[PDB]
Amino acid sequence: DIQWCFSQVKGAVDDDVAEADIISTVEFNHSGELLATGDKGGRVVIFQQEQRGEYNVYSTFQSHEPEFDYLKSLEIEEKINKIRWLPQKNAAQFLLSTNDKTIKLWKISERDKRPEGYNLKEEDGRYRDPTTVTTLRVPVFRPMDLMVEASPRRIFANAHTYHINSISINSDYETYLSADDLRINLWHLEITDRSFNIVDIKPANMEELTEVITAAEFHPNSCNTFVYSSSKGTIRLCDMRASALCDRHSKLFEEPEDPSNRSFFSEIISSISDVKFSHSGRYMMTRDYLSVKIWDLNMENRPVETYQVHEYLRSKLCSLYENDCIFDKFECCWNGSDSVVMTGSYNNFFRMFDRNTKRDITLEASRENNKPRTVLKPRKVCASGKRKKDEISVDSLDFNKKILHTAWHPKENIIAVATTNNLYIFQDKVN
Amino acid sequence: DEKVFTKELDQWIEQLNECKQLSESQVKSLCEKAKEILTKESNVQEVRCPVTVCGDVHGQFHDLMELFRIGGKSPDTNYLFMGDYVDRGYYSVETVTLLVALKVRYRERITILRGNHESRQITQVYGFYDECLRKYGNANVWKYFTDLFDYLPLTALVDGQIFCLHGGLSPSIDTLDHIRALDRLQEVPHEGPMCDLLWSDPDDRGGWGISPRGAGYTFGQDISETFNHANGLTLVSRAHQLVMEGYNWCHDRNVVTIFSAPNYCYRCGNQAAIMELDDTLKYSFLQFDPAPRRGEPHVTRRTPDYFL
Amino acid sequence: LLELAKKKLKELEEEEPDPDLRKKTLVRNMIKKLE
Amino acid sequence: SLYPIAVLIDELRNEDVQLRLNSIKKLSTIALALGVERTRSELLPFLTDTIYDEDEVLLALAEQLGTFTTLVGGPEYVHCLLPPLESLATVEETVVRDKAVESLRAISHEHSPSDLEAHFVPLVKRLAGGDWFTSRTSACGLFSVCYPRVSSAVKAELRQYFRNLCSDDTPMVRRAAASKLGEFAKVLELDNVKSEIIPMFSNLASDEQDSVRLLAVEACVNIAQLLPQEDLEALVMPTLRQAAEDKSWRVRYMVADKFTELQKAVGPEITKTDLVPAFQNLMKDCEAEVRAAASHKVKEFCENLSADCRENVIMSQILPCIKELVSDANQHVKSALASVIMGLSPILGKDNTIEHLLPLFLAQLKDECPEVRLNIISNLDCVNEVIGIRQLSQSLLPAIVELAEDAKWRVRLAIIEYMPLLAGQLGVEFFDEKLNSLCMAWLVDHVYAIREAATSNLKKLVEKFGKEWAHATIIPKVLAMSGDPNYLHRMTTLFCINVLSEVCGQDITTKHMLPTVLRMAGDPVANVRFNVAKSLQKIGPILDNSTLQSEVKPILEKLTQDQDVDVKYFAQEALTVLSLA
Structure with a gap:
């Protein structure tokens, strides 16, 4: 087990942070250097890795602005739902980003470089x-000091009647998708007026509503495969070759529901929250409210691995219904080599399993016990009443510090864990 | 001479045919002429039959041009409107500008009324202010158009037998001297007979009722036929309420609701009828589906050029 | 547990101005499955 | 004297987008005024790397730099435009890169062989060995301009560089290479083509993406047009056969859309021997766009088949596919097939036409979907000139009569537009004995656009029937149409008079129609008074004083006293239109 070692922390120290300081995404980039953290309000804040180094701030730019709808006259919002990077075309780096309506x-x-030389005016x-x-004289160029500056180039807008909860660049440098609650449009990265509705599961009339779309991906190697999830537990695996309209599945990954643990909430703790392909193109881990579960692309009717995240909650599941803590969109990310997997959890713990040795850990991202280059020792929560000096009774976990969003450096062994108002960047000890 | 002004206005009409942006001085002069024409007119504009009646447009330019094609080109066929030229629309500015231009060119062969959504707070909140901010970047145009709205006649008496207004009726109204007693140079109020007149809607529910909009009232049929008998009226045309069928007969055929804006808010996909006052006062409807939008819709099931 | 009839108060006293339909669809398909 | 130029040279340094754009466009005057031993060293180094990111500024700058072959100093210093263009060839945008590449190619012709090999070839090699995947994308299009005029070693090096590009990683580079494959091959030695481009074509037509495999089809078309016909069966044909049975429907659609050119390239023998099965498979495809595209080329394909067995093959292989497609479920397929099914009639002799083409025709006409009837009707000329429509008129009549009356006036407008051709192709007595009833209803139709179209079609007919037929047919009906209550129907008679006077002649108009018009002048609706003024204004140019001063002038004088303003204005307009000044 790579013993993890605190490395950094961002954000403030006072726990009265306004609503526009809750980090709402964390995404490294293809080569590893940068790291974007788009909190609420829109204020993307890009960190560059110091040429291991620490991460110092690079740019900052209000991405989205509090808008207002005309027809439905709604309070169209400004949260940052996703931040996807593009590959590197030149010395500039691009990145999409979306609130509930725009991209x-x-x-x-x-x-x-700054122009130096004037004709009809003085230096002032x-x-x-x-x-x-x-x-006549022509302006000359002379050096100045680095001034990083962001600016929007296109705006894909006004195509989604419902809210947006996904994007994914297609594996051919040209197009991408954006899946709202019921449809999936396939935009083009240079045409900001037309889309192509590629899936629709909206019924004839609204009142007979069964399921919605809660995630959507693409394939890291294939150009014609997305995997849009489904709010009942199923996972279609579409295919944009056999027909222009990809509404009909080419596979359907569905657990053959287990009647043993059937309970009252047997449909609300089994609704997928984020599907994430596996860096090579073979597995497709998905995270519902209680277990990450690694599907396989060649065996539809069952997963090949199942990891229980916070099993000690299947009792309190009743009490978790009156504070709206049962609708929570947790998120899971892969290793760089498809051997370790991480997911968030409650009370600032973040479980990270291990595929090849079947071990597991439980670290704790917190402040008042950790200094740089120390080690995080595994916290071990206890379910019973027998508690002895190194375990927390489940009657004491604070159900208001949720580690929803997380990332993982592509090649190296650095991770970024984003609690409510900080961005701990625990790496491992380079020896 | 008026000839040069008319030729310049015709050239601007052809320019509008080219869909060209306008300058400020033109709109200011047009507004000044409109106000000069309108200050002498009272709340009850006298429109002489025959005429083509149309209800809400809400600034949808394409539906307006389609209406123009179906009903003929002005001034060969007379036209009339019943308010709601703003709010819940994308192209309000072009609509109002073309309306004012055609009105000035053909003062006596076209009439335009005012609507409940022609109120300072409502227009400021519902798109129009944002639209002007996007097209000019300043609120002067907003002030000019609100000044023009103030003078707009509230109601129209067609040939002394048919009465047409945008909003609805009011309990305190029994005869038109009430409307002619109002001072049309004011902001749309929140209470009073004029508000209920502009903010009311028909009530199929028996008796009186509370308007769900929170401003106005819901006139019953009793007052309607009492008004008709007192003033010898047959029908009372109206608009401002959406109907999936374009027009409906309610209150024992006493009320005909006209809507000239297919797919109001671009969601309901309704029909749109125009109840033409024939030479002999009969009612004819020429229903038209939502106008085919050019190079639209953006979202289609059909494969676009880049994908094919 | 079985007493969810009272906890139905959530979807009962809600006035959603079109928020996301996942949370509405869940509590709306949750009661009809039993009641 | 240089004040405006002094303003302009500093105006490309402001913050207004329009100001900088205008300065960029006018850069020519600044360059001309500065000189020629100063431009290269002062202005170009300033434009070398600009921080303008607007698509409308960089585009203009590139297009301007593309036309500086003279101001820089002449064809001897043209290599001074490379530093400022290589910096635009590698910008994040796409149209800017395309324009920069086009300008680079345009100015490449001004170099000299030694100058080329010294200063331009290094630019290509550099861009095609760069680091970003935009230098390579832009370099992938400068080989077809610098291959012909270079030495042998440089030629081999360029070939190696292109072969390296065709095996790149970023799909964008491979797309560019696939796009420029044919344009490059069109300048290579034939043996070198066979031995070097073919492997590239195969490796790009068996790609793992599909945005590359779809362009491999156009590359195949060009290559086939290049090579002789003794090797197509061993070099190109296997790849085309593989592509015609691809897995991604985009490749099959591209093959279908490029079938006439593919046939013209491969030749008649290979066409007849191999392509026909591929065409049948394309028609019977499971997709919809593939079927539509393959149907669109039903006529162009059958028209270019070998004359030896054209009729046999058509009736033995292709006819059943069309017969099945006629009753297809999709709409685009049916519309596309209908629009071109008329080209097959003149290929048989009208005997096979009557024997099997007729049914399909009736099925299409009887189709309850719109635009299918419109397409089938609009091209009737074929069978008219092959079977003699007089024979089929018995079947045409029900379809035309049922299509004339519909709900939406859009179909009513498209068929009224198509009416005049059929009217001319049908006859005189047949038309008058039948479609005359229709003509009358058309004028009293509701939607005004249909009234316009009916009046225009009347004009076209009376211009094709001259005077006597009109005088013996419509004259009384249109004249009596002036009693309808709706003023629109009387104005319709007014426009009909206006459009028909110049074709019926003053000897009859003024003698019979005019007095009615003068009666209409006194309508109780102003909408008609000014219409009758406009009509008088329109017939005046063919009216003389004898009748003018006798009847017209009193009428205009009376109109000028009307209460309405427009009536007076239009009466005055007429008064002046009489060339009286």
Whole structure:
């Protein structure tokens, strides 16, 4: 087990943070350097890795703005739901981002050149006589200090009647998708007026509503495979070759429901929250409210691995219904080599399992016990009343510090864990 | 001379045919002429039959041009409107500008009334202010158009037999001298007979009722036929309420609801009828589906060029 | 547990101005499955 | 004297997008005024790397730099435009890169062989060996301009660089290579083509993406048009056969859309021997776009088949597929097939036409979907000139009569537009003995656009029937149409008079129709008074003083006293239209 070692922390210290400080996504980039954290309000904040180094701030830019609807006249919001990066075309780096209605395509670039030379004005702009000029001069270029600056290039807007909860760049540098609660449009990264509705599961009339779409991905190697999830437990595996309209599945991954543990909430703790392909293109881990569960792409009718995250909650499941703590969209991320998997949990713990040795840990991202380069020792929660000095009685977990969003450096062994108002960046001890 | 002004306005009409953006001085002069024409008119504009009646448009330009094609080109066929030229729409500015231009060019062959959504707070909140901010970037146009709205006649008496208004009726109204007693140079109120007149809707529910909109009232049939008998009226045309069928007969055929905006709010996909006052006062409807939008819809099941 | 008839108060006294339909669809398909 | 130029040279440094755009466009005057031994060293180094990111500024700058072959100093210093264009060839945008590449190609012709090999080939190699996947995408299009004029070693190096590009990682580079494959191959030695481009074509037509495999089809078309016909069965044909049975429907659609050109390239023998089965498979495809595309080329394909067995093959292989497609479930397929089914009639001799083409025709006409009847009707000329429509008129009549009356006036407008051709192709007595009833209803139709179309079609007919037929047919009906209550129907008679006077002649108009018009002048509706003024204004140019001063002038004088303003204005307009100044 890689013993993890505290490395950094962002955000403030006072626990009265306003609503526009709750981190709402965390996403590294393809090569590893940058790290975007788009909290509520829109204020994307990009961290660059110091050329291991620590992460220091690179740019900052209000991405979205509090809008207002015309027809439904709604309080169309400004949260940042997803932040996906694009590959590297030149010395600039691009990244989509979305609130519940829009999708912008920002662009972050450095600049160290300033025009130096004027014709009709002085160095301060104070203009001289119009006619006294005798020899024209052309501005020259001379160095200045790095001034990183973001700016939107396109805005894909007004195509989703419902809220947006996914995007994914297609594996061919050209297109991507964006899956609202009931449809899936396939945009194009250079055409900001047309879309192509590729899936629709909206019924004829609304009142007979059964399921919705709670996630959508693509395939990291194939150009014609998305995996849009479903709010009942099923996972379609669409295929954009056999027919232009991909409404009919080419597979359907569905657990053959177990009648043993059937309970009262047997449909609300079994609704997928995030499906994530596996960095090679074979497995497709998904995370419902109580167990990450690693499907396989060649065996539909059953998963091949099942890891229980916080099993000590299947009793309190009743009490978890009156405080709306049972609708929580947890999120899971893979290792760089498809051997370890991580997912968030309550009370700031974040479980990270291990595929090849079947071990598991439970660390704790907190402040008042950790210093740089120390080690995080496994916290072990106890379900019973027998509690001895190194376990927490489940009657004491604070059900208001949820580690929803997490990431994992592509190649190296650095992770970023985003609690309510901080961004701990625990790495491991380089020896 | 008026000839040069008319030729310049015709050239601007052809320019509008080209869908060209306008400058400020043109709209200011047009507004000044409109106000000069309108200050002499009272609350009850006298429209002489025959005429083509149309209800809400809510700034949908394409539906308006389609209406123009179906009903003929002005001034060959007379036209009339019943308010709701703003709110819940994308192209209010073009609608109002073309309306004012055609009105100035053909003062006496076209009439335009005012609607409940022609109120300062309502227009400011419902798109129009944002639309002006996007197209000019300043609120001067908003002030000009609100000034023009103030002078707009409230009701229209067609040939002394048919009465047409946008909103509805009011308990305190029994005869038109009440409407002619109002001072149309004011902001749309929240209470009073005029508000209920502009903010009411028919009530199929028996007797009186409380308007769910929170402003106005729900006139019953009793007052309607009492008004008709007192003033010798047959029908009372109206608009401002959405109907999936374009027009409906309610209150024992006493009320005909006209809607000229297919797919009001672009969601309901309704029909749109225009109840033409024939030469002999009969009612004819020419229903038209939502106008085919050019290069639309953006979202289609059909494969686009880049994908094919 | 079986007493969810009272906890139905959530979807009872709610006035959703079109928020996401996952939370509404869950508590709306939750009671009809039993009542 | 240089004040405006002094303003303009500093105006490309402001913050207004329009100001910078205008300065960029006018850069020509600044360059001309600065000189020629100063432009290269002062202005170009300033435009080398600009921080303008607007698509409308960089595009204009590239297009302007593309036309600086003279100001820079002449064809001897043209290599001074490379530093400022290589920096635009590698920008994040796409249209900017395309324009920069086009300008680079355009200015490449001004170099000299030694100058080329010294300063331009290094640019290509560099861009095609760069680091970003935009330098390579832009470089993948400068080989077809610098291959012909270079030496042998440079030629081999360029071939190696292209072969390296065709095996790149980023699908964008491979897409660019697949796009430029044919354009590059069109300048290679034939033996070198056979031995070097073919492996590239195969490796790009068996790709793992599909945005590359779909462009491999166009590459195949060009390559086939290049090579002789003794090797198509061993070099190109296997790849085309594989593509015609691909798995991604985009590739099959691309093959279907490029079938006439594919046939013209492969030749008649290979066409007849192999392509026909592929065409049948394309028609019987499970998709919908593939079927529509394959149907669109039913006529162009059958028209280019070998004359030896055209009729046999058509009737033995292709006819059943069309027969099945006629009753298809999709709409686009049926519409596309209907729009071109008329080209098959003149390929048989009208005997096979009557024997098997007729049924399909009736099925299409009887179809309850719109635009299918419109397409089938609009091209009737074929059978008319092959079977003699007089024979089929007995079947045409029910379809035309049922299509003339519908709900939406859109179909009513498209068929009224198509009416004049059929009217001309049908006859005189047949038309008058039958579709005359229809004509009358058309004028009193509700939607006004249909009234316009009916009036225009009347005009077209009376211009094709001249005077006597009109005088013996419509004259009384249109004249009596002036009693309807709805003023619109009387105005319709007014426009009909206006459109028909110039075709019926003043000897009859003024003698019979005019007095009615003068009666209409006194309508109790202003909408008609000014219409009758406009009509008088329109017939004046063919009216003389003898009748003008006798009847017209009193009428305009009376109209000028009306209460309405428009009536007076239009009467005055007429008064002046009489060329009186």
